[PDB]
């Protein structure tokens, strides 16, 4: 059938791209998009309509910014009858804000689960709702969607949950290795832990400390909304200890100093 | 030659055990010692003697208890000229203190990286200081120690930062389910963790979450130790959290419920 694209941007692009190549006709509203949007629509070669015509398609994907959501959500809530699926890094609360504006159509929370950069649409996408059925069909169109939870707010909630128990990890590794790395024992460490939590260990353990240095700011936001989330559901404990860690990571030895 | 072992309890019965059935002479003093004590000796065979002959050994090991070990080591300090083995579960400064004892021979900070009852004798042993691989010359005789670090202390931190890791990483698990758990995703979050963590994960991570649950009191009190010993070198930020949770904890999806 048709699928219509609200935003038109890396995640659209790629997911867009694989739809066209399987004989999906992919749609997109280039009116008031800036030229990056509107070049990576045109090297897609999607089909530049109207609002409401995006609108009118039997699935509709939301893939702007966090902070538009709900606003794409409103504006898209008066006109779409068939599915609206937002794959926006929103919170679970915001998703079901987002499901409340969707008044005439299905709503389905999708959660995108790894790198668009190095996975492509190939990336794993997880969905939930009544309608999360109906957008997995895309499988037979070069997707990768499955269905988990019931309802609007569980992908995302997964996603969020995933997400929080590693960077969770990951702070927990630099407390241990910058207290190793004082004595002159990181590599001993790293060493001992590589016997009970894997082989390739190491490697991803050291990648994830550079990333949550470098993204230390980013990653302090991200704490916040899981200690929001957790909080409606138990009394979160890690979360301020995790943000404390955060708040001091502002040559992976060189990581470690201070 | 001869192995004297200072305290002869669970640990001295399983090593002087495996020492024995390999041709050395094991000695320790019984003169003050309890019934349970003499009678792992008796059952063992070891050579009882002075404490002054104990001393005499060319390798003395310490296994006695952690309120016990720097007074050990300061009587047998004034007199052992060969190697004496600290093997008391006591803080990375306590071993540099007791190392300051052994005036007149070398010290070796071993640290026992298991369990004991289950793995027996065949327990890998880490042990650090100068005289290191001359300790490490017991592996002829059954043993299976490893050298780590370089001074006296060293085995012991890296034992305590595995520890400090491998519990931490419990806790943060069980919070994660916990909140999954409240919300019907737990195991939907698991089968993402392992669709991340690469290795077995969730296989490794139901174990991991059962055991802590099971000894809930001994990993609140380990916890409080480690979070001591973390204070010698760093100003620790995660243990006050991961203390919380083992304090709560005090068919896996029956421990998620705070
Ligand atoms: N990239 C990833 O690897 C990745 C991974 C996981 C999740 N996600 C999520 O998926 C979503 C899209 O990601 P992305 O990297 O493609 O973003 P971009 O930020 O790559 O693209 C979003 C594009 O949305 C448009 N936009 C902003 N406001 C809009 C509005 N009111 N109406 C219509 N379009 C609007 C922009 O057009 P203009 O440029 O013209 O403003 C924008 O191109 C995000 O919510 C993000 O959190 C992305
Ligand atoms: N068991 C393990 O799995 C394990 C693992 C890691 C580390 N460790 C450590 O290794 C050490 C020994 O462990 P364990 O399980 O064998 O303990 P026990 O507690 O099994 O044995 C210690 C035995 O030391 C003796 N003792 C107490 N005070 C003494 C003194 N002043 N002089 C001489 N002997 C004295 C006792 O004699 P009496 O019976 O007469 O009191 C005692 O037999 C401890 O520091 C412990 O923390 C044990």
Known sequence: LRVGFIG???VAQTLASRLRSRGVEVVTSLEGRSPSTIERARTVG?????????YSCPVVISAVTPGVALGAARRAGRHVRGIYVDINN????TVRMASSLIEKGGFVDAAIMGSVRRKGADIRIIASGRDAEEFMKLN???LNIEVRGREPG??????????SYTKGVSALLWETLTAAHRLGLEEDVLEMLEYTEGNDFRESAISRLKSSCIHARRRYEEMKEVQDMLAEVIDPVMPTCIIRIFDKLKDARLQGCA
Chains 1, 2 share one sequence.
């Open 90 to 93: 929103i919170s679970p609360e």
């Open 140 to 142: 037979r169109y070069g």
């Open 154 to 163: 569980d992908a995302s909630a997964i996603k969020m949950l995933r997400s």
């Open 46 to 54: 999607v089909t530049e309509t109207s609002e409401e015509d995006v």
């Open 8 to 10: 038109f941007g890396e």
